[PDB]
Amino acid sequence: VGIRFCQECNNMLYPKEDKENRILLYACRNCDYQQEADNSCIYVNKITHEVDELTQIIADVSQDPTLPRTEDHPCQKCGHKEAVFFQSHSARAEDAMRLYYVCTAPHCGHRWTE
Amino acid sequence: SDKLSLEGIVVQRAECRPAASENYMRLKRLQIEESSKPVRLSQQLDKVVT
Amino acid sequence: GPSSQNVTEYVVRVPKNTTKKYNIMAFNAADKVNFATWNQARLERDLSNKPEDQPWLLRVNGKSGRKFKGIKKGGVTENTSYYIFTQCPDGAFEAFPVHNWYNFTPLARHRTLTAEEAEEEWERRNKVLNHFSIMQQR
């Protein structure tokens, strides 16, 4: 996890290890730049449902005329008594017909599931 | 004289907008009319050319 | 203090004819260049054409410093305009129209893979190993 580039030729960094010190080095495979890593991560894969749609919905979705509105689920932060609820329709799950709610107040848009 | 010089660096960006909202659309209409002066479209003849 | 409620108002001036041309310049945010090191420069037209309709090619500090290449802006200033307010001792701004927008890009100086030997090594479509050894032979 975490992608960043070298400052010399601005190409993709790659992991590498040295035998003298035994420390991870994110070195540029193109140029001759090296740097010390700070996470000890290379390849994180997520097989089950870790999409975290709560942080993926754009808060401006509330002002879409085609979405339903409800008053039984008030906003937690600003306390507005109107919200817009919708489902996900994303692949890799094809299930979990759950509702994601977005507050319709301007200068707001806290997303919450329930 | 083929002499290159650097005047300086931009420190802030500015955007100018007209105060008028509705009446400025008339000036926009005039500008569009002026822009459509030289565009050409086919004409129609009353009598066949001989 | 005076800076909290500073009041400034200077007169704008637009000359008609000016013997020297202006152009907007903008590096990329990630270039991270320095201007003190730019002791010498050479801004000449590229030789790849073989004049006014060709790109430039910046060469900083000869072969020691970095080189840059760029292109004119695709858009045209038919509706838009760019003016620069140059500071002067008398304080009157001098708005100056520009002629072109330029964008040079960084280029790295190192032994580069050639097209012919690239074709030669293309046989190793995905069988290639030891990426350092690719450049070591050359």
Next chain:
Amino acid sequence: DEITPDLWQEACWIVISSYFDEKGLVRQQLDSFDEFIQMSVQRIVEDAPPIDL
């Protein structure tokens, strides 16, 4: 002021009538052909490069 529910039917049909009084049923054919003759032919002729010899 407001279209009453019991005057709606007449009203809507009046609107539709006006549409068909102004456009017609084959308006797409005629409008497309008018576009072709008025501007497409002229644009095609002007867009063609000059003959250099």
